[PDB]
Amino acid sequence: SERPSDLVVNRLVLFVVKGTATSTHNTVKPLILLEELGVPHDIYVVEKVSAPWFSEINPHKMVPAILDRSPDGRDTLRAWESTSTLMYIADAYDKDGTFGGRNVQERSEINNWLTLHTAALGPTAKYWLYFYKLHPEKLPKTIEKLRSNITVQYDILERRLNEPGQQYLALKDRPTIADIATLPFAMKSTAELFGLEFEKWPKLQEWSVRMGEREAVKRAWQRVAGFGHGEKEYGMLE
Amino acid sequence: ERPSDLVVNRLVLFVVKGTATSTHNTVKPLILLEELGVPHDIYVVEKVSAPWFSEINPHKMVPAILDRSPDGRDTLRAWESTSTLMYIADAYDKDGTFGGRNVQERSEINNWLTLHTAALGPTAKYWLYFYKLHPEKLPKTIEKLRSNITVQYDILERRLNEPGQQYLALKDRPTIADIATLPFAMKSTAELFGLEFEKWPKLQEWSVRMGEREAVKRAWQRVAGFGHGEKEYGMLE
């Protein structure tokens, strides 16, 4: 179809939906990294991700998605899938690799822990929530297995954060796009949604609190809850 | 402690014995190694549950990589098939032939690579897990995962019907996005899922075009053969 009247690309545009307890856990990831790097950006609140105009931006028809100007400003490019939005923002805006990785060694571990989330906890959590409340019929045995698979992912993260000096998932010294991608599915509130006691993974809990105390993370959680509840319900925010 | 025959004089790719279902992820890094002509060893892991292997991949699966850092100071590791592709591209694809030359190329490569990593990859794995490995058969779950595979095929079909779009990410050449997607988007794997792959003609054409690449042929031949040659387990000659 046609782009809405109010959709223009003068800078990075992050596509989101109306903030709810379960609508923000993927969209908050690129928003954390934008807040961390202080990247100039707009927010577009999509009413319907099923709308044909949106599929042209993200053929998977989900948020988050990004439209941005190419480095020279002549062309517009796109990023979609939360992990891909983190990789794009790091590529375009994190030139000294503070969150992307400064060398092959740092990027090897960042990509390991980022991909572990993208392949395992991320999709498992998405399937858990889908079967738990979106699938027309309730399938408790499938829901229970997916819940059990989440505990195995928590076990792997817990083991990593028990290693000497390992303050963050990828690097010892600082948080990376691996930590940002993992945080929304490895914090107390999300653990409680899954029906899990988060205190059973103490180093992972400590890690999640340490991440949550970062000012950029606080600002991202604030803003993502508010999107679509302000003066403008849908479209390009002021 | 590591086995005596495990040494890292070059990139070491960890695999298991080649079977009908054991190679769909390990073949991915092997394809890119073959494409770039990276010097490498193959280590056939008998038990991925072995404590020594959990030190290399805490997720206890193949593929996994041990390699020397470019400066030679560190022994790096890569694990998760998508991450092994990202590492090999980072360390050995100087010109970004498979990794992407600029921000614009990498934007689309990372889009289609991640779509596989998050959607078709894990959906396929969950399908096979419930279909044959879960103690109980759950037909309604298996059907929904099968339905989700067709939705991913539909997305890939739509992409390959765009003007001049010969590959998933870039128009002109295949990338690590194409390598990651191929093993779960070819006729043999489509048949395993109980799907008729002719229903996605551009996707089938793409899968044939990929399969005709010499690096891809060599990768498929070698991955099937691992553990069935002179040596059953450990470092191959």
Ligand SMILES: N[C@@H](CCC(=O)N[C@@H](CS[C@@]1(Cc2ccccc2)NC(=O)[C@](S)(CO)NC1=O)C(=O)NCC(=O)O)C(=O)O
């Ligand atoms: N997220 C990771 C997961 C890799 C992984 O699952 N590796 C499996 C064999 S790869 C496959 C393929 C496949 C899946 C579905 C349909 C066809 C092929 N084969 C499998 O048999 C299993 S183990 C089934 O769950 N899972 C897999 O992903 C392994 O280590 N097996 C050891 C053994 O048990 O001896 C990645 O993408 O790298």
